[PDB]
Amino acid sequence: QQPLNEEFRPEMLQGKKVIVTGASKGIGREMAYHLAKMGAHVVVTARSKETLQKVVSHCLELGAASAHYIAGTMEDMTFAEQFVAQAGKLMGGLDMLILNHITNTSLNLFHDDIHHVRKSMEVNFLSYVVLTVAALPMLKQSNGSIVVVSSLAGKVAYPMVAAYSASKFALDGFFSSIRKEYSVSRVNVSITLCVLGLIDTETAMKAVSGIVHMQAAPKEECALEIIKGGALRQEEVYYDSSLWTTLLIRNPSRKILEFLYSTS
Amino acid sequence: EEFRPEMLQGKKVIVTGASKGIGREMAYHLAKMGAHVVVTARSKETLQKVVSHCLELGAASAHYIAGTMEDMTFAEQFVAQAGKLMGGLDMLILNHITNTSLNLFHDDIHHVRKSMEVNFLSYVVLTVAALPMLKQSNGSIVVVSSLAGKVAYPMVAAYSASKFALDGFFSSIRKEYSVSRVNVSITLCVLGLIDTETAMKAVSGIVHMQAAPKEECALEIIKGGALRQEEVYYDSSLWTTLLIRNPSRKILEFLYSTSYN
Amino acid sequence: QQPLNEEFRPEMLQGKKVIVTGASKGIGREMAYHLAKMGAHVVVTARSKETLQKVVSHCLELGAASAHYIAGTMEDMTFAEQFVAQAGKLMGGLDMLILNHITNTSLNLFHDDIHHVRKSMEVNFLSYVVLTVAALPMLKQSNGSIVVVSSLAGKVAYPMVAAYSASKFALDGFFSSIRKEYSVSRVNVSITLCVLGLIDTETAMKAVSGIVHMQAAPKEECALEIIKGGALRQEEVYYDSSLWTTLLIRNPSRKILEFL
Amino acid sequence: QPLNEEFRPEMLQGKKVIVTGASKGIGREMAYHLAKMGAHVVVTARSKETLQKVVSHCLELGAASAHYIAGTMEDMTFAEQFVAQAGKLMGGLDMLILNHITNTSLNLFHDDIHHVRKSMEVNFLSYVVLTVAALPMLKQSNGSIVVVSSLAGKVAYPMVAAYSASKFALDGFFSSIRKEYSVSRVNVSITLCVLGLIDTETAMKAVSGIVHMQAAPKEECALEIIKGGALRQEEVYYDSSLWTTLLIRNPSRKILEFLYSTSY
Numbered sequence A: 001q002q003p004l005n006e007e008f009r010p011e012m013l014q015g016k017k018v019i020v021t022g023a024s025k026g027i028g029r030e031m032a033y034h035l036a037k038m039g040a041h042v043v044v045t046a047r048s049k050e051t052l053q054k055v056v057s058h059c060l061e062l063g064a065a066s067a068h069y070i071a072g073t074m075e076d077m078t079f080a081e082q083f084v085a086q087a088g089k090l091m092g093g094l095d096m097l098i099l100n101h102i103t104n105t106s107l108n109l110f111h112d113d114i115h116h117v118r119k120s121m122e123v124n125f126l127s128y129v130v131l132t133v134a135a136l137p138m139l140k141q142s143n144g145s146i147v148v149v150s151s152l153a154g155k156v157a158y159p160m161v162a163a164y165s166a167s168k169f170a171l172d173g174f175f176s177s178i179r180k181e182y183s184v185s186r187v188n189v190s191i192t193l194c195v196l197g198l199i200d201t202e203t204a205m206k207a208v209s210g211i212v213h214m215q216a217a218p219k220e221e222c223a224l225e226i227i228k229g230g231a232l233r234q235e236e237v238y239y240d241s242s243l244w245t246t247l248l249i250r251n252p253s254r255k256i257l258e259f260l261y262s263t264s
Numbered sequence B: 001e002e003f004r005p006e007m008l009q010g011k012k013v014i015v016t017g018a019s020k021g022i023g024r025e026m027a028y029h030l031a032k033m034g035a036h037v038v039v040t041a042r043s044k045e046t047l048q049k050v051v052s053h054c055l056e057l058g059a060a061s062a063h064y065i066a067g068t069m070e071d072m073t074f075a076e077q078f079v080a081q082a083g084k085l086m087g088g089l090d091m092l093i094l095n096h097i098t099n100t101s102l103n104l105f106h107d108d109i110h111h112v113r114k115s116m117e118v119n120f121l122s123y124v125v126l127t128v129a130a131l132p133m134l135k136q137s138n139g140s141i142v143v144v145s146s147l148a149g150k151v152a153y154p155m156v157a158a159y160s161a162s163k164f165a166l167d168g169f170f171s172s173i174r175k176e177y178s179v180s181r182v183n184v185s186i187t188l189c190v191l192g193l194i195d196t197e198t199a200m201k202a203v204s205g206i207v208h209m210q211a212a213p214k215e216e217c218a219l220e221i222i223k224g225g226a227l228r229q230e231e232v233y234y235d236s237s238l239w240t241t242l243l244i245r246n247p248s249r250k251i252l253e254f255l256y257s258t259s260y261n
Numbered sequence C: 001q002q003p004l005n006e007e008f009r010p011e012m013l014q015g016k017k018v019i020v021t022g023a024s025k026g027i028g029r030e031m032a033y034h035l036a037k038m039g040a041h042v043v044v045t046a047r048s049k050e051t052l053q054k055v056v057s058h059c060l061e062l063g064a065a066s067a068h069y070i071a072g073t074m075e076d077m078t079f080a081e082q083f084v085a086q087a088g089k090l091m092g093g094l095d096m097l098i099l100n101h102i103t104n105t106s107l108n109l110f111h112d113d114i115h116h117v118r119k120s121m122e123v124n125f126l127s128y129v130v131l132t133v134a135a136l137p138m139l140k141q142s143n144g145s146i147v148v149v150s151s152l153a154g155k156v157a158y159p160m161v162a163a164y165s166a167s168k169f170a171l172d173g174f175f176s177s178i179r180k181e182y183s184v185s186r187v188n189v190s191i192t193l194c195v196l197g198l199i200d201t202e203t204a205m206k207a208v209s210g211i212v213h214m215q216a217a218p219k220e221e222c223a224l225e226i227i228k229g230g231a232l233r234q235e236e237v238y239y240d241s242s243l244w245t246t247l248l249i250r251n252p253s254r255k256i257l258e259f260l
Numbered sequence D: 001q002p003l004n005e006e007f008r009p010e011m012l013q014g015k016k017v018i019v020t021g022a023s024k025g026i027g028r029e030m031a032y033h034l035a036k037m038g039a040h041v042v043v044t045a046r047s048k049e050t051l052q053k054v055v056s057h058c059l060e061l062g063a064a065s066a067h068y069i070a071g072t073m074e075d076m077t078f079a080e081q082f083v084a085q086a087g088k089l090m091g092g093l094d095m096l097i098l099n100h101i102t103n104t105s106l107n108l109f110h111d112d113i114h115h116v117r118k119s120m121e122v123n124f125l126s127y128v129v130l131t132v133a134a135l136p137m138l139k140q141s142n143g144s145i146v147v148v149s150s151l152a153g154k155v156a157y158p159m160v161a162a163y164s165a166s167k168f169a170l171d172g173f174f175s176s177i178r179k180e181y182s183v184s185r186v187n188v189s190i191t192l193c194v195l196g197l198i199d200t201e202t203a204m205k206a207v208s209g210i211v212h213m214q215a216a217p218k219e220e221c222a223l224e225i226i227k228g229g230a231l232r233q234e235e236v237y238y239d240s241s242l243w244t245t246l247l248i249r250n251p252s253r254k255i256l257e258f259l260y261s262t263s264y
């Protein structure tokens, strides 16, 4: 899509109607806090109602125009579809959909855990598609934005996270193809793919402990950079400690291959 | 070393989606090389004709097992049956896909899930089922993917998601096999448009571009797998093959590798 | 280098004091005309005194704030130095230094032509450094810009232009290094290196005839893109017919290596 | 077309080799390795006295023969005459190692046109003159030209503007003639050596009080240059860090050189 040739300003999110998934902790929670500070209307989701309630409490205090939570599992495609319709009724519409949740994952060699591969695909990928289908009519009304939280493991291969990597690679293939479809069918809904390096979330620090030794970037800045990129309608956001990653990760050969086919 | 057809002589090979298109051409090349072949697809009628032709071409043996890769039990039992019939397995060629059309994504989640189950998940189930036999022979896994599995194209969103998932999964396990000394090679084949009857029906006339020969495509997949190459590139244009390579990805992968204990 | 984060508007060049070398023909001539239409002050140079006179008169006609010529050969380092002093005296300062001239060159296999190697180095490179040195005190006063016209042959190897390719590569090495120096020593003079593919100029079309067969980009658009990048204080300008070159020619690995 | 074989010191046995800037640093180390390999060696630099000591050590090391010719590479007549005499001394030429540079310090560029001109003359123009004079003997032997460059000849660094310009010019000239030779079937290889900081006495004095990075050993450096030269490799990379080697490669330039070639 066409990005906004503008600098980011917090006023851009004031009164905006935002959904944040997997917002009970880590990056999702930090995104909900930044959005609350900007005076946005926020609807947060995850499975734990107790942690989600704590997130909403802080959001209301930070100055959100409104803040609500709806608890449930993204393993359940009916909840996924119903969540969006409910989130839209609470805010009276939708401007931005931030898809960020993932199924529980640990660092382990792949052996025979087909059920983890399937669950990663359903939760990390399939539910995102279901949420997008549910949200698209409201997003078309507001010329909104879809923000997809991915990973460096969704752009390059990593040992010990095969199922996870597969699900993140699937997000790129699906959302990048539909971005091209939206360009041709003149659908004014932006799609931002966020390619993240290791972030200092509670889950990440526990998961890589004693296995991986590398710099973890701050979650607060990470969340803000995701919100900025989505607000500016950027196609991709890259955020990592090294940079290095930042400038090596871009793929101009892919861009030429995609442009040269945007003529056949 | 250069490829020699004798590398496949007497080799025990599975080819999925082999009743037509690229898969069928692969069974034929393997048959001419004197390999033991087990082919699969849902249609027994078409598989019967592939098997009789494989025998005419000089296959050491050729048999079919019919079933749907939507069924994970079939996928698991298929590998056990094929391997028990040939007395082992040297090479697993994963090529089947669910029926696909060029269409703008239109709330068809069922097609996204089916594409993920057939084009991606069943490949994992087949690999898990085949791994003990492939470890015994220091065998090979050949994963047929697409240019739409490396770059974004409109009208094949579900298909593209499934092909991208193959890269993430198989490229990740390849790193794991390298560090855990699993002597089973993994080859990802990135194909441009191929002149299969299915591709020609689906693309003409929404798109205008040169389709590469299916016979030569099939041979190049076999060569790459036999040579244990990580990735095989095949397109009408040599310029496309130059653009598929991602050296930055390879640097990042090596850099991130050193963080692991 | 901090580029101006605004879109290009021709008003950016109104009343600006601009030198254009190699301005008697091709891209240099086209640059003088664009700047004239934008209402800039122009001082054009090359050897052809009669052609420069015709260029200056057409510049005044297009709406240049002033137009003057100083004729001479950039083989002569004394001339190069005095040309800048004299050009700066005519305009009452200097805002943009556009280094575009090159020695006459053809496509030939290199065998033993040391003369052509030395001449390309002296004219296409050394004179650019002499002009920059002479221009710097004025550019420092105006927070001005140095625009270096290079080539794709200044970024990648091409057979048949070995001497020319050496001089263009030397430009990248010299100017990108001084750009790093200006940022650390806080010298607010911008440096734009322009990487061009084949352009439809008369000299180029005659030189590549029957030797090289490929699309040539228009000289008028090329000239404009050079001025835009310079005005916007961009580090590098890429201009070529194929949108393969433009995004493949960037070097992120070089950027990492430089980040120190 | 590089040699599809492992390097062996025996590849240099009885080879006729010129090493410029061989009185000290990397050049001296290259002369010593070649001597240990039993090559015939002709060394040059300005230092008559230290060149005699280098030569005597080369003989002690087992060189087939060793001679020196002293002079300045600022003098193009000396450069031309040196090659002719080196060729007579050895009875031909198999390898031309171009390594000398004019005196260089780390300094901000101000108005030092003399240093720019001298760097261009010595570090670049004398290499071309030496190549031209050597070519008939190199064509007779299917020989090799080895050009010692630098990271400052691939990327921009402050404080070395004149030097960097001269090293970039070696890349443009020698890489263009390499394309010419391959298409006109001239069986003379051209090796461009891209070096990171090396622990020579001159480098260590010049960086003291400025940058603080690990300098690689001069003896391993010298050998790596000879190996790349003997193997007919287009480029040799040598640095203290393996990460530098990965970053020096320019696959986009290699792609572009290929598409531009088809138009000839």
Ligand SMILES: NC(=O)C1=CN([C@@H]2O[C@H](COP(=O)(O)OP(=O)(O)OC[C@H]3O[C@@H](n4cnc5c(N)ncnc54)[C@H](OP(=O)(O)O)[C@@H]3O)[C@@H](O)[C@H]2O)C=CC1
Pocket (backbone or CB within 6 Å): A021, A022, A023, A024, A025, A026, A027, A028, A045, A046, A047, A048, A051, A072, A073, A074, A075, A099, A100, A101, A102, A103, A104, A123, A149, A150, A151, A152, A196, A197, A198, A199, A200, A201, A202, A203, A204
């Ligand atoms: N942290 C990092 O280093 C990196 C993170 N990322 C990406 O950033 C995003 C967030 O990362 P991070 O904050 O570390 O993740 P966390 O593990 O901290 O949180 C994941 C969130 O998803 C929720 N969730 C888990 N299972 C389900 C389910 N079945 N249904 C619905 N929601 C569920 C969790 O809440 P609850 O369990 O209560 O449901 C929680 O709110 C992810 O998309 C991840 O891939 C990318 C690269 C690196």
Ligand SMILES: NC(=O)C1=CN([C@@H]2O[C@H](COP(=O)(O)OP(=O)(O)OC[C@H]3O[C@@H](n4cnc5c(N)ncnc54)[C@H](OP(=O)(O)O)[C@@H]3O)[C@@H](O)[C@H]2O)C=CC1
Pocket (backbone or CB within 6 Å): B016, B017, B018, B019, B020, B021, B022, B023, B040, B041, B042, B043, B046, B067, B068, B069, B070, B094, B095, B096, B097, B098, B099, B118, B144, B145, B146, B147, B191, B192, B193, B194, B195, B196, B197, B198, B199
């Ligand atoms: N042709 C092209 O242009 C390109 C092809 N490719 C890839 O190459 C491979 C083959 O392509 P192509 O030959 O054109 O494909 P075809 O459509 O010709 O054949 C697909 C094969 O899969 C079988 N199949 C279909 N559905 C199922 C199912 N549910 N369970 C099991 N098998 C099934 C089919 O047989 P049956 O229906 O009887 O089951 C058939 O044998 C695929 O992986 C594709 O993505 C990649 C890029 C371009």
Ligand SMILES: NC(=O)C1=CN([C@@H]2O[C@H](COP(=O)(O)OP(=O)(O)OC[C@H]3O[C@@H](n4cnc5c(N)ncnc54)[C@H](OP(=O)(O)O)[C@@H]3O)[C@@H](O)[C@H]2O)C=CC1
Pocket (backbone or CB within 6 Å): C021, C022, C023, C024, C025, C026, C027, C028, C045, C046, C047, C048, C049, C051, C072, C073, C074, C075, C099, C100, C101, C102, C103, C104, C123, C149, C150, C151, C152, C196, C197, C198, C199, C200, C201, C202, C203, C204
């Ligand atoms: N055209 C193309 O395809 C490409 C062009 N370029 C670059 O663009 C720039 C201009 O190209 P182009 O317009 O094609 O070249 P032209 O040959 O058309 O013009 C070159 C100019 O330099 C002048 N000049 C020549 N010799 C001298 C000298 N000794 N002293 C002073 N001035 C001299 C000429 O004027 P006079 O003879 O009167 O002195 C003329 O005005 C150059 O830097 C070139 O390398 C880069 C890539 C491709």
Ligand SMILES: NC(=O)C1=CN([C@@H]2O[C@H](COP(=O)(O)OP(=O)(O)OC[C@H]3O[C@@H](n4cnc5c(N)ncnc54)[C@H](OP(=O)(O)O)[C@@H]3O)[C@@H](O)[C@H]2O)C=CC1
Pocket (backbone or CB within 6 Å): D020, D021, D022, D023, D024, D025, D026, D027, D044, D045, D046, D047, D048, D071, D072, D073, D074, D098, D099, D100, D101, D102, D103, D122, D148, D149, D150, D151, D195, D196, D197, D198, D199, D200, D201, D202, D203
């Ligand atoms: N050392 C490093 O960190 C790096 C070195 N390099 C490259 O490696 C090469 C050697 O570097 P290094 O060994 O460090 O340098 P040194 O300064 O140690 O030696 C350079 C040699 O050139 C000779 N020389 C100097 N002036 C002239 C002249 N006018 N005519 C002829 N010979 C001359 C010197 O001998 P005498 O004074 O007797 O004439 C000396 O033998 C150079 O090409 C350099 O650019 C590249 C990257 C980093």
Ligand SMILES: CC(C)(C)N1CCN(c2ccc(N3CCN(C(=O)N[C@@H]4[C@@H]5C[C@@H]6C[C@H]4C[C@@](C(N)=O)(C6)C5)c4ccccc43)nc2)CC1
Pocket (backbone or CB within 6 Å): A102, A103, A104, A105, A106, A107, A151, A152, A153, A158, A161, A164, A196, A197, A198, A199, A201, A203, A204, A207, A208, A212, A214, A215, A240, A241, A242, A244, A245, B255, B256, B259
């Ligand atoms: C040059 C220097 C400075 C030394 N660099 C070193 C390399 N580098 C880098 C490389 C890789 C990574 N990641 C990002 C991808 N990835 C990931 O998304 N993991 C996530 C993360 C942890 C765990 C698995 C997975 C889901 C988690 C969850 N919440 O359930 C649990 C959160 C990943 C996986 C395993 C190891 C590392 C990573 N981040 C940064 C840049 C910095």
Ligand SMILES: CC(C)(C)N1CCN(c2ccc(N3CCN(C(=O)N[C@@H]4[C@@H]5C[C@@H]6C[C@H]4C[C@@](C(N)=O)(C6)C5)c4ccccc43)nc2)CC1
Pocket (backbone or CB within 6 Å): A257, A260, A261, B097, B098, B099, B100, B101, B102, B146, B147, B148, B153, B156, B159, B191, B192, B193, B196, B198, B199, B202, B203, B207, B209, B235, B237, B239, B240
């Ligand atoms: C740079 C230059 C040289 C100018 N090139 C431009 C042209 N180019 C190119 C682009 C795209 C393509 N393909 C390959 C991927 N892809 C694909 O896998 N399709 C398949 C194919 C057709 C249909 C969808 C899908 C499954 C099919 C089945 N059997 O069910 C049915 C078989 C695809 C999709 C739609 C159109 C084209 C393609 N091939 C080549 C390469 C680069």
Ligand SMILES: CC(C)(C)N1CCN(c2ccc(N3CCN(C(=O)N[C@@H]4[C@@H]5C[C@@H]6C[C@H]4C[C@@](C(N)=O)(C6)C5)c4ccccc43)nc2)CC1
Pocket (backbone or CB within 6 Å): C102, C103, C104, C105, C106, C107, C151, C152, C153, C158, C161, C164, C196, C197, C198, C199, C203, C204, C205, C207, C208, C212, C214, C215, C240, C241, C242, C245, D259, D260, D263
């Ligand atoms: C296949 C398609 C898609 C058609 N592409 C092909 C590849 N491509 C491309 C490649 C190369 C080039 N150049 C640019 C460098 N270069 C150059 O600067 N030449 C210049 C030019 C001509 C001559 C030598 C030199 C000085 C000249 C003068 N004024 O004295 C006289 C002006 C050059 C040299 C010889 C041949 C080509 C070129 N331009 C475009 C983009 C398009």
Ligand SMILES: CC(C)(C)N1CCN(c2ccc(N3CCN(C(=O)N[C@@H]4[C@@H]5C[C@@H]6C[C@H]4C[C@@](C(N)=O)(C6)C5)c4ccccc43)nc2)CC1
Pocket (backbone or CB within 6 Å): C256, C257, C260, D101, D102, D103, D104, D105, D106, D150, D151, D152, D157, D160, D163, D195, D196, D197, D200, D202, D203, D204, D206, D207, D211, D213, D239, D241, D243, D244
């Ligand atoms: C990304 C990571 C992995 C972290 N690395 C960052 C750091 N790095 C690096 C950077 C720069 C350098 N050099 C090489 C170029 N260069 C050089 O050629 N110098 C030479 C050297 C010194 C002096 C100038 C010049 C001629 C000298 C002579 N003999 O007259 C006198 C000898 C140079 C200059 C000053 C400082 C350093 C260097 N070497 C390594 C490698 C990559």
